[PDB]
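Let's do one together. I've listed all components of the complex below, 214 residues spread over two lines.
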Amino acid sequence: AGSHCQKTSLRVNFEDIGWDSWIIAPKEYEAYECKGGCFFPLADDVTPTKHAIVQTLVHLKFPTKVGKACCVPTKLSPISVLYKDDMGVPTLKYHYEGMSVAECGCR
Amino acid sequence: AGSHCQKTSLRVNFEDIGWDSWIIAPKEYEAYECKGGCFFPLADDVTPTKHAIVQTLVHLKFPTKVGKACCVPTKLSPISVLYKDDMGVPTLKYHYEGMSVAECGCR
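Okay, and this is what the predicted structure of the assembly comes out as:
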């Protein structure tokens, strides 16, 4: 199937999320999103752990008692932001970690 | 709030999931499950990445276009299983990795 767990675009405006109080720049960045579902047969590039597999199997058997595996970011990349310091000096954070999806997987 | 992302019990029977074809023992093990939700204010022991935070914020603003952060296992533990080899010899896998939840978090 072609509707499995995968990286798709998500452009994030810092004002929308209340972060423009401390981020001067940029206005928007490409965060990613991980979209789709984790069901058998698994999409090939989704990594999965043995727990995710077992959980997906248990969820088929008891769909009302046990959740499914979740499609989530499993590796993240940094971006750079311009924020303000104590004297109000615009300052660059070169690698602000965990901001964009590098990889998605079932977990 | 007390309904946030956390480790709860999940006992898994290998027959239920079709794994008893290759696992002699045990019949059942404690896999865990990660239950609850990822919403603000975040539960304290949930780790979260900056992406999970940004995504949760974007989901509040656009709940129909963007998913929430997911409560998932973020660290896994091994267990031991007894399986069968080529001559049909019962063989012990001492650390079969990724079988039980050690930690949960929002991702």
